[PDB]
Symmetry: C3
Subunit: 240 residues, 3 copies
Amino acid sequence: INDMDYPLLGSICAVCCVFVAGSGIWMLYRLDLGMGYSCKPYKSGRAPEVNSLSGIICLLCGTMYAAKSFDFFDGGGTPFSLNWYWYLDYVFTAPLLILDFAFTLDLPHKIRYFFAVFLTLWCGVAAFVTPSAYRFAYYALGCCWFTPFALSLMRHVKERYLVYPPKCQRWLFWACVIFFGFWPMFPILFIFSWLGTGHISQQAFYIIHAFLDLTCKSIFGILMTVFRLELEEHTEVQGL
Amino acid sequence: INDMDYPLLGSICAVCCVFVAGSGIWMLYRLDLGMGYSCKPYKSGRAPEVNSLSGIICLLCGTMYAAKSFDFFDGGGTPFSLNWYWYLDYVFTAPLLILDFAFTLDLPHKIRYFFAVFLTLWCGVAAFVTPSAYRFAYYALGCCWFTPFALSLMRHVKERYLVYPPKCQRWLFWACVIFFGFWPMFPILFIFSWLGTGHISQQAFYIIHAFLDLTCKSIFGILMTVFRLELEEHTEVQGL
Amino acid sequence: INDMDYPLLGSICAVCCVFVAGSGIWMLYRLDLGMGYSCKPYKSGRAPEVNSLSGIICLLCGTMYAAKSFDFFDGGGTPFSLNWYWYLDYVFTAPLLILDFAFTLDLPHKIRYFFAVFLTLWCGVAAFVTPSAYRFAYYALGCCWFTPFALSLMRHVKERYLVYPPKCQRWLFWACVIFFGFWPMFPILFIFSWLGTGHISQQAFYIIHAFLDLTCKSIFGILMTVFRLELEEHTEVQGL
Ligand SMILES: CCCCCCCC/C=C/CCCCCCCC(=O)OC[C@H](COP(=O)(O)OCCN)OC(=O)CCCCCCC/C=C/CCCCCCCC
Ligand SMILES: CCCCCCCC/C=C/CCCCCCCC(=O)OC[C@H](COP(=O)(O)OCCN)OC(=O)CCCCCCC/C=C/CCCCCCCC
Ligand SMILES: CCCCCCCC/C=C/CCCCCCCC(=O)OC[C@H](COP(=O)(O)OCCN)OC(=O)CCCCCCC/C=C/CCCCCCCC
Ligand SMILES: CCCCCCCC/C=C\CCCCCCCC(=O)OC[C@H](COP(=O)(O)OCCN)OC(=O)CCCCCCC/C=C/CCCCCCCC
Ligand SMILES: CCCCCCCC/C=C\CCCCCCCC(=O)OC[C@H](COP(=O)(O)OCCN)OC(=O)CCCCCCC/C=C/CCCCCCCC
Ligand SMILES: CCCCCCCC/C=C\CCCCCCCC(=O)OC[C@H](COP(=O)(O)OCCN)OC(=O)CCCCCCC/C=C/CCCCCCCC
Ligand SMILES: CCCCCCCC/C=C\CCCCCCCC(=O)O[C@H](COC(=O)CCCCCCC/C=C/CCCCCCCC)COP(=O)(O)OCCN
Ligand SMILES: CCCCCCCC/C=C\CCCCCCCC(=O)O[C@H](COC(=O)CCCCCCC/C=C/CCCCCCCC)COP(=O)(O)OCCN
Ligand SMILES: CCCCCCCC/C=C\CCCCCCCC(=O)O[C@H](COC(=O)CCCCCCC/C=C/CCCCCCCC)COP(=O)(O)OCCN
Ligand SMILES: CC(C)CCC[C@@H](C)[C@H]1CC[C@H]2[C@@H]3CC=C4C[C@@H](O)CC[C@]4(C)[C@H]3CC[C@]12C
Ligand SMILES: CC(C)CCC[C@@H](C)[C@H]1CC[C@H]2[C@@H]3CC=C4C[C@@H](O)CC[C@]4(C)[C@H]3CC[C@]12C
Ligand SMILES: CC(C)CCC[C@@H](C)[C@H]1CC[C@H]2[C@@H]3CC=C4C[C@@H](O)CC[C@]4(C)[C@H]3CC[C@]12C
Ligand SMILES: CC(C)CCC[C@@H](C)[C@H]1CC[C@H]2[C@@H]3CC=C4C[C@@H](O)CC[C@]4(C)[C@H]3CC[C@]12C
């Protein structure tokens, strides 16, 4: 029985659509202005393609929630629902975030991080659709993909959290707080959801992910964008 | 009721399969011969990977119509139909065209153009499968993705439509005629199709897209290929 | 009627999961140690991203068989089966192998090889799901994609099978034996399977592919990894 306040879920996703996509539009707006706060012709004249992943993820997530709002506003499972099959939305955005983060600090093993998160989500997608005792087997299969990735990412972050000046170090620090504080929240919610323990009802499950995706895309993307501006101001505007 | 001349639709797709794929085979045939009309060892000996997207798109589209012909020749919706779920075919080819066009003139924002068309098609794919009033909401969601992309592409084309010599400028001009004259034809057909207004029956809907895809893949790809030959003849064969 | 020894098929896939993924873990283990057998700081300190495709394919295939084991252990077609729709698993791994092989020897036409195998598998995926006389039409469509690719790959291999020293030439030779001896085995099995002639029952069909995927991913990947070590030892450790 999925009797729940669908217009409320549609309203939240509509609000999340405006904020995440609106931040994405601003995110691309500030990219093609200069190296940082000061406007510069950006050498050739075009920003690097690796510096525009943060904005597109929000727009990709912004239109993702718009489609979910249409599913929720209708009052059931639309053919193009994006909500009936869980976590299929994050299969495309989440591997872009770590790749976007990898290019920001020039982290190594960018391809490994992409497939670690791509396969973590797909294992999770398999968990929701399987209504058997092997749903936790896929979850266990997902967790043994995410855990080595999370611990390997944290290490390479600590190495790079040593040369950046304190001006841009705070922006990197808050990005990691969103990273390691809210990415592990998705597996935790699955355990306690109606699929696992049962503490969290399905209606409240959508709402938490709506706020998590604000944090993981828009707010994390804003932190990355401001971090790039401070980084390029200190290096390519100050020479140091 | 989908009572329509399926063998006619299969015959058209079979004919479209031969022409588009046949052009693609020629497209890759002329690439590995030299810089342009005159044969040159191409420096290293291999053509750049970015210069072979035009041919593969036609082969990808050529085999795409072969699968549609099998669906039409059977006389219904085959399990691997490629026609029951509309525009799922263009989700992979259309984002390759703008990326192929972007690499040809070295347009900036190549990643943004890819996702603008990738998400334009997916929003359109969502429109066909949803049999509710939100089908036009997905169409409105698709149009607000395509329109900024179309206007931003046109601008960066005008900037590059200033340095090319008139010999290769005509090839670029006709590519843009196919670009901005026939890409906007796909959204227009959706409004007037049986899903929207109802002017165009479903049987005639396949036929128009069969000719549009000839123009958008094979004919547009031929224009791009000839444009590259003239471009490289003037630059890397003449020194100017 | 699919009455077959499902726990046996689950056990084989579980065993294949451990070996392929275990080899993949070792494959990435030996990459970040040095150029070859001798440990070297690898210039910058990080291995090239193109040198880590072999390990990830095995991990991608290792987790692929784990999901199949869950489907087989359950005793039927799970919602996330990976076995009900055939060859959908290889759509992602097989195009990575030829791309991984292309980067190893710096083969040209890397993009063409990727789409040749990507479209060969998709045409094959269409063959299994279509229960009509056009299943062999998709197979014929797949074979006319694979055959030009197989013959073009063989040629460019012969050109590169001339400069490598005999120390690493044996590793390349055995990689080609796995390449041209076992990749053509997949189309051959389809003809003689229960879909085609009928010699091979469905129960025995999974088992052969389980051993083929060991050879095509783990054993082929091991051959590629050892080949890289000998190649880099002779070039970047010996100077020759
Ligand atoms: C919009 C921008 C998106 C950008 C990125 C998109 C990529 C993500 C792809 C999303 C795939 C979406 C699949 C969603 C399937 C949802 C199926 C579903 O909702 O089933 C439930 C529902 C039952 O609900 P009720 O009938 O109301 O029951 C109550 C009794 N009155 O069943 C149905 O409605 C029937 C579903 C019709 C067929 C579904 C067609 C799905 C759309 C196909 C396009 C996606 C192509 C995917 C490629 C693989 C090819 C299958
Ligand atoms: C060939 C080269 C292709 C290269 C690139 C390919 C990428 C594009 C992927 C295309 C996905 C194709 C999905 C097509 C689904 C079509 C479903 C369909 O036709 O339903 C209609 C039809 C009803 O018609 P009738 O029975 O005749 O009614 C009349 C009464 N006698 O329903 C059916 O036939 C049942 C369909 C069987 C299941 C469909 C299986 C689809 C094939 C799955 C492979 C695709 C994998 C996609 C990945 C996501 C996993 C789902
Ligand atoms: C785990 C790591 C994976 C990493 C890479 C993954 C990428 C590959 C994607 C794999 C797609 C998997 C699709 C598998 C569909 C299988 C459908 C199936 O099994 O049907 C058979 C089965 C009939 O069997 P029985 O009922 O037992 O009959 C006996 C009588 N008692 O039918 C069912 O069980 C109903 C199926 C429920 C719906 C299936 C939902 C599939 C999961 C969707 C997630 C995949 C998203 C794909 C994107 C396109 C959107 C559709
Ligand atoms: C619907 C089914 C679709 C499934 C199709 C699967 C096809 C797989 C798609 C491509 C696989 C990814 C391989 C891409 C090649 C990797 C890029 C490359 O060659 O290296 C370029 C270069 C290498 O570094 P160097 O130049 O040596 O730096 C020296 C230091 N100054 O790039 C880099 O710097 C590292 C960053 C590379 C990009 C990071 C990886 C991103 C890859 C995206 C994967 C897409 C997967 C799609 C789904 C997969 C399903 C299995
Ligand atoms: C089935 C579900 C599958 C979904 C999986 C989604 C994974 C996403 C796959 C990869 C995402 C794309 C990121 C690729 C990295 C971008 C390439 C890069 O790093 O830059 C290399 C380099 C950067 O430029 P510079 O060297 O700085 O030029 C200086 C001027 N002389 O490349 C360029 O020149 C620009 C062209 C880059 C390629 C254009 C973008 C193409 C990306 C393909 C996207 C594939 C998406 C797949 C589906 C997405 C679903 C959400
Ligand atoms: C769910 C539906 C998803 C479908 C979305 C389809 C989007 C397509 C995704 C990207 C398409 C691939 C285009 C990638 C751009 C090609 C890379 C490029 O620009 O060149 C970089 C550079 C070019 O060579 P040079 O630098 O000139 O060497 C000089 C010699 N010293 O790279 C190379 O060296 C060659 C290797 C390039 C990578 C090989 C190709 C891999 C592409 C992966 C394709 C992914 C397809 C995804 C599914 C497709 C579905 C249709
Ligand atoms: C716990 C409460 C959470 C509330 C949700 C958050 C709401 C969004 C507010 C921003 C959150 C992230 C901000 C990250 C910190 C950056 C703030 C900042 O100060 O940035 C500046 C400058 O950079 C910026 O401008 C970034 C801030 C811009 C954020 C824009 C907000 C998002 C845009 C959405 C607009 C569209 C929304 C549609 C309406 C919503 C309808 C529901 C950096 O320099 P300073 O530290 O100030 O030092 C001064 C000297 N340089
Ligand atoms: C409104 C009527 C539309 C008719 C459909 C179009 C039919 C295809 C004909 C070509 C259309 C696109 C042509 C674009 C313009 C290029 C023509 C051209 O002249 O190219 C040359 C040279 O480049 C070329 O050769 C390109 C033309 C090659 C086109 C090959 C036709 C497509 C190949 C398909 C063969 C397989 C078809 C299978 C049979 C079909 C069965 C149904 C450029 O140099 P010139 O301007 O002539 O100046 C001379 C000094 N340099
Ligand atoms: C017909 C029987 C087939 C049996 C299946 C194969 C079993 C796996 C055994 C390895 C097969 C591939 C080996 C390829 C040849 C490499 C062997 C080798 O000698 O490598 C060395 C060194 O490189 C290596 O070490 C590669 C061999 C490492 C293979 C590791 C085996 C795979 C790892 C799986 C461990 C996890 C498995 C989980 C348990 C399985 C549970 C079911 C190269 O140098 P040399 O020729 O010896 O000259 C000496 C001076 N240099
Ligand atoms: C309470 C929830 C929201 C967050 C839980 C995770 C927190 C505690 C984690 C994630 C981000 C983290 C940081 C990651 C990186 C570094 C750099 C290192 O050289 C010093 C510690 C340090 C600074 C971390 C300390 C604690 C940290 C804040
Ligand atoms: C009638 C249908 C087929 C086509 C409709 C769109 C037409 C009118 C558009 C698309 C291609 C276009 C061109 C795009 C680029 C340029 C370069 C600019 O510096 C002068 C005008 C100019 C040359 C355009 C004029 C008109 C144009 C031909
Ligand atoms: C968002 C900006 C860029 C505008 C682009 C979206 C436009 C073109 C879309 C959104 C609203 C649309 C309408 C949605 C609903 C209908 C009812 C249908 O039976 C006839 C066409 C019709 C009337 C549409 C035609 C075009 C339309 C105006
Ligand atoms: C019997 C099954 C397993 C394998 C069938 C295919 C075999 C016969 C093929 C695939 C790998 C092949 C090799 C591919 C490349 C070369 C390099 C060339 O300069 C000499 C011959 C040579 C060395 C081949 C000879 C035969 C070969 C071994």
